[PDB]
Amino acid sequence: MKVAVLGAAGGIGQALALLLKTQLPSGSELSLYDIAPVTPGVAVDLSHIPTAVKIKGFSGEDATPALEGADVVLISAGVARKPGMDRSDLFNVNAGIVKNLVQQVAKTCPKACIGIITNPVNTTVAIAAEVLKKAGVYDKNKLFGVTTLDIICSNTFVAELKGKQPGEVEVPVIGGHSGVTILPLLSQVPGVSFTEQEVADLTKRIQNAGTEVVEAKAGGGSATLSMGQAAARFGLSLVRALQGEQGVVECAYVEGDGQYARFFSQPLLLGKNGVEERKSIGTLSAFEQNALEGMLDTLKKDIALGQEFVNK
Amino acid sequence: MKVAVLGAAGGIGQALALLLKTQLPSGSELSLYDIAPVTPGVAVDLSHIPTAVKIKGFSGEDATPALEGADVVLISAGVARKPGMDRSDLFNVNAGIVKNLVQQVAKTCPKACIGIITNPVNTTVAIAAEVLKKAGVYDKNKLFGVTTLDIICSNTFVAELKGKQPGEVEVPVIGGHSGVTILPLLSQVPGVSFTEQEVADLTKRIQNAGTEVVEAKAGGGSATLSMGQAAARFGLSLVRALQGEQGVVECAYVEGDGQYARFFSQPLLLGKNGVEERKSIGTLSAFEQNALEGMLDTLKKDIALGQEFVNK
Ligand SMILES: NC(=O)c1ccc[n+]([C@@H]2O[C@H](COP(=O)([O-])OP(=O)(O)OC[C@H]3O[C@@H](n4cnc5c(N)ncnc54)[C@H](O)[C@@H]3O)[C@@H](O)[C@H]2O)c1
Numbered sequence: 001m002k003v004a005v006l007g008a009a010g011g012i013g014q015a016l017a018l019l020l021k022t023q024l025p026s027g028s029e030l031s032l033y034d035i036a037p038v039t040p041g042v043a044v045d046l047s048h049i050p051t052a053v054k055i056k057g058f059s060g061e062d063a064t065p066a067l068e069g070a071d072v073v074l075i076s077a078g079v080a081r082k083p084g085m086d087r088s089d090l091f092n093v094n095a096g097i098v099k100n101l102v103q104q105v106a107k108t109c110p111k112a113c114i115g116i117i118t119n120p121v122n123t124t125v126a127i128a129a130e131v132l133k134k135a136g137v138y139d140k141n142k143l144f145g146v147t148t149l150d151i152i153c154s155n156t157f158v159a160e161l162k163g164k165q166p167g168e169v170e171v172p173v174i175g176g177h178s179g180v181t182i183l184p185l186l187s188q189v190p191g192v193s194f195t196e197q198e199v200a201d202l203t204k205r206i207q208n209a210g211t212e213v214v215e216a217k218a219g220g221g222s223a224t225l226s227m228g229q230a231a232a233r234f235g236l237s238l239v240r241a242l243q244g245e246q247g248v249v250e251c252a253y254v255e256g257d258g259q260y261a262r263f264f265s266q267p268l269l270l271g272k273n274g275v276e277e278r279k280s281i282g283t284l285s286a287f288e289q290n291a292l293e294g295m296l297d298t299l300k301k302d303i304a305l306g307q308e309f310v311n312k
Numbered sequence: 313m314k315v316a317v318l319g320a321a322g323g324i325g326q327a328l329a330l331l332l333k334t335q336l337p338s339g340s341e342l343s344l345y346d347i348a349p350v351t352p353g354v355a356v357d358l359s360h361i362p363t364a365v366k367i368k369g370f371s372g373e374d375a376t377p378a379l380e381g382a383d384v385v386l387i388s389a390g391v392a393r394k395p396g397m398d399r400s401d402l403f404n405v406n407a408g409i410v411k412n413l414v415q416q417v418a419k420t421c422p423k424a425c426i427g428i429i430t431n432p433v434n435t436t437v438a439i440a441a442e443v444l445k446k447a448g449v450y451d452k453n454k455l456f457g458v459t460t461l462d463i464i465c466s467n468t469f470v471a472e473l474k475g476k477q478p479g480e481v482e483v484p485v486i487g488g489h490s491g492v493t494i495l496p497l498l499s500q501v502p503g504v505s506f507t508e509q510e511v512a513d514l515t516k517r518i519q520n521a522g523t524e525v526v527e528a529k530a531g532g533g534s535a536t537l538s539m540g541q542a543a544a545r546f547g548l549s550l551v552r553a554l555q556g557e558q559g560v561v562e563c564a565y566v567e568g569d570g571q572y573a574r575f576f577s578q579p580l581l582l583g584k585n586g587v588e589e590r591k592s593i594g595t596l597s598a599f600e601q602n603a604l605e606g607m608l609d610t611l612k613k614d615i616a617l618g619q620e621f622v623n624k
């Protein structure tokens with residue numbers, strides 16, 4: 001069981017490598033890759049931690065060494081923010097990085113499950129998908145846009161409001177991963193009942209959580225520690241499922257029946273080959289159906305943007 | 313149970329806070345403080361993780377709000393390295409930071425156990441002690457220098473060499489926290505015998521474990537993630553002992569009988585008021601007894617250096 005992390009030297013990368021080193025099952029292997037020179041050292045730093053998990057770091061323009069024999073590849077490489085670039089700039093830079101890395105993955109470990117964390121996710125898994133097709137190795141069951149962060153913030157906010165135990169709430173979240181494309185199915189949360197005003201407020205807080213962090217760090221960056229935690233959960237769910245465990249359900253952004261959009265985030269049953277079964281989003285409330293229809297256009301443009309990036 | 317972390321925005325601090333946010337028992341509270349303005353956002357970032365541990369972060373030059381009601385204070389503030397600064401420069405900077413911070417601790421939460429991570433630990437815990445004395449609130453049972461890092465590194469190297477599972481080895485380390493004052497009692501590792509050569513090699517490596525990480529980072533970085541891990545285990549040990557758990561033993565740098573030096577790291581039984589019992593280092597090997605006496609004068613100066621700092 002070998003897991004590869006691309007963009008390991010970054011905030012999200014270090015918090016993820018750290019949690020994975022101390023949580024992956026024994027015998028498991030962890031390789032880190034990043035263009036930053038410090039990457040081999042990050043690995044050395046983590047190797048001093050006494051767990052049954054081998055770990056190595058690599059730098060350079062070639063990530064082959066890190067990808068060889070990998071069963072899981074988590075991509076958190078990219079850019080969060082830099083002085084001088086705006087909305088367009090970030091996308092322009094992250095799209096290229098994703099294109100390159102998924103490209104190297106296609107040639108090195110085409111059978112690995114790929115979790116993409118790099119934003120914007122709605123558009124980046126599309127780029128990834130298109131890059132895999134042009135190589136003849138695309139398998140929509142093994143391409144996932146990591147949206148777990150939305151799920152845990154929801155669990156947290158709901159627990160806080162209804163005074164529940166944080167670890168007893170599991171809110172399914174569908175749609176996309178940005179502003180109005182994030183849709184928490186608050187109507188499907190066992191036990192708790194919500195007020196229309198609370199569904200309106202919560203939903204708003206969940207959709208803006210990322211921004212809430214950025215403003216708090218005062219331009220100092222975006223969520224890294226919570227995202228690292230979120231990616232870890234997703235990483236282990238995949239490993240567990242890839243190892244034969246039963247009933248591992250997780251919400252992710254995959255290519256399913258285009259009933260709403262080519263790629264949509266919905267409950268998935270994970271197994272030995274990635275997605276085993278895309279599950280029905282079930283019953284939705286008036287508020288939920290309205291929020292859904294009112295965002296399909298936006299999600300489709302995000303996806304469109306992505307496909308156009310590859311196919312020109 | 314309120315735990316405070318000073319310097320929470322640094323490399324070590326963020327890994328530490330992350331690990332504590334998810335591992336402190338339910339009901340615990342975590343308050344982060346650092347001069348970096350990004351600090352409250354670090355807390356907001358971490359508050360999005362669903363664990364029953366309340367968290368708040370603060371910045372500015374007054375740690376009071378973070379210190380009020382604190383049961384445990386972990387200090388990791390300081391300077392790992394800055395261009396243009398050499399050995400003595402770093403020391404003066406770190407010495408002054410620990411002085412300023414302990415003083416605030418003395419004023420706001422005088423009965424909290426203090427765990428100093430800032431290096432050089434051999435000198436910094438001495439400084440803290442003096443600061444607490446001059447304020448008239450010193451309690452030698454509640455001040456510790458965190459040396460756990462030397463422990464986990466030893467555990468990892470030993471298992472690797474004698475082919476054991478990383479998690480089943482526990483090497484006691486005594487003395488100081490730097491260079492020659494780090495003495496791993498390899499002779500006490502049950503069911504494992506070593507060659508005067510093995511001991512010679514393991515011992516020198518364990519003492520240079522850090523440098524190993526620095527060189528692997530092309531000179532621009534230090535062991536941050538393994539340190540966060542080590543400080544997490546230490547902190548969790550203190551919390552558990554403070555909650556009344558029995559049998560919690562941990563090697564830490566504290567003041568005891570001046571049998572070897574005023575401050576000496578040795579196994580300790582932790583209890584409800586901090587150090588409850590200072591256990592004997594037990595039986596040493598020839599090599600060990602020999603390494604011990606050979607470093608005593610160095611450790612004593614490290615200590616003298618800290619006492620003279622807080623008096624001129
Ligand atoms: N899915 C989510 O919920 C979510 C939440 C927050 C952020 N993100 C996104 O994840 C990414 C990670 O941001 P971060 O905070 O870690 O940023 P960061 O800048 O701290 O880390 C990014 C890392 O990428 C590395 N990198 C750059 N180009 C690379 C390349 N070609 N190959 C490999 N590594 C490369 C950098 O050296 C750096 O260490 C961003 O794009 C961010 O927008 C996703």
Ligand SMILES: NC(=O)c1ccc[n+]([C@@H]2O[C@H](COP(=O)([O-])OP(=O)(O)OC[C@H]3O[C@@H](n4cnc5c(N)ncnc54)[C@H](O)[C@@H]3O)[C@@H](O)[C@H]2O)c1
Nearest residue numbers: 319321322323324346347388389390391392429430431461
């Ligand atoms: N005990 C050990 O085993 C061990 C191992 C390695 C490093 N360390 C030491 O721990 C410290 C942490 O290093 P790091 O890698 O996190 O460095 P870092 O630079 O990443 O973090 C240090 C933090 O200290 C903060 N700080 C500085 N002055 C402050 C003040 N007066 N009040 C509050 N916060 C202040 C900084 O803003 C920064 O976030 C260093 O002194 C390092 O030498 C200890």
